[PDB]
Amino acid sequence: KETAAAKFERQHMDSSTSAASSSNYCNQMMKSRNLTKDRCKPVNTFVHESLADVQAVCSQKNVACKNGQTNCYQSYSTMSITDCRETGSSKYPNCAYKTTQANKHIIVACEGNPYVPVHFDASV
Amino acid sequence: KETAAAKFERQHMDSSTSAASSSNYCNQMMKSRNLTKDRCKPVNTFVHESLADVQAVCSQKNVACKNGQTNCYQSYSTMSITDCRETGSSKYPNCAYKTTQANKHIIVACEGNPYVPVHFDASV
Ligand SMILES: [Cl-]
Ligand SMILES: [Cl-]
């Protein structure tokens, strides 16, 4: 079983690019990160910062998570992100995603020792 | 019982200001929109655009909702928004919120006739 920290890395980290360079970014990344294997994951955000910078958020601003838990943290700075969301034309096994690049604060839930991101809650 | 459309208006519309003017915006708005009555709502976004502009999103870009439903719409333009999230010091009946102003696309779920916003899904 994949650990929670490793799942967060796979689903939400893309440190190899500064930003989405095209409308096809999401189709490509959702497939390669294995988020379209048995069905199309409806919504998924990738963060274009170093793993260290994203892990550091776990000691930044403590804020409520949408679900009411209190282990969420909001990044002090904005970060480059890409939101990937299925379009109307999307139908497994032909998943199709809209790519929206933005620079926003991220909010992650953190857990464990070491205390690292385990869920992506939202961006602001 | 409050209708779904009316609940969305109460929770998510603030057309009377162009933007949050201070760090106290959320404390004030969460109280006055009756979102701290019996407990502190953990997270809530207010949109600083006209009701007409927000309703118009229901005929803009159809995108997946986070929960997998297909009745979500992403605004073509960015809109002025304020995210309100409980801080660590927050404890009912003394709710306390961090105020984060941003300009972002909004994503809402739409339902009904007329086809209007009934949930705030996320911002990008
Ligand atoms: Cl996500
Ligand atoms: Cl919200």
Curated annotation (Swiss-Prot), chains A, B:
GO molecular function: lyase activity; nucleic acid binding; ribonuclease A activity; RNA nuclease activity
Keyword Nuclease appears in the UniProt entry: yes
Active-site residues annotated for this sequence: 12, 119
Tissue specificity comment: Pancreas.
A GO CC term assigned to this protein in UniProt: extracellular region
GO biological process, one term: defense response to Gram-positive bacterium
Outcome following mutation: residue 12 to A: Loss of activity
Protein localization: Secreted
Carbohydrate attachment residues: 1, 7, 34, 37, 41
Disulfide bonds, paired cysteine numbers: 26-84, 40-95, 58-110, 65-72
UniProt keyword annotations, A-Z: Disulfide bond, Endonuclease, Glycation, Glycoprotein, Hydrolase, Lyase, Nuclease, Secreted, Signal
Listed EC numbers: 4.6.1.18
Similarity comment: family membership: Belongs to the pancreatic ribonuclease family.
Function summary: Endonuclease that catalyzes the cleavage of RNA on the 3' side of pyrimidine nucleotides. Acts on single-stranded and double-stranded RNA.
Protein name: Ribonuclease pancreatic
Source organism per UniProt: Bos taurus (Bovine)
Encoding gene, per UniProt annotation: RNASE1
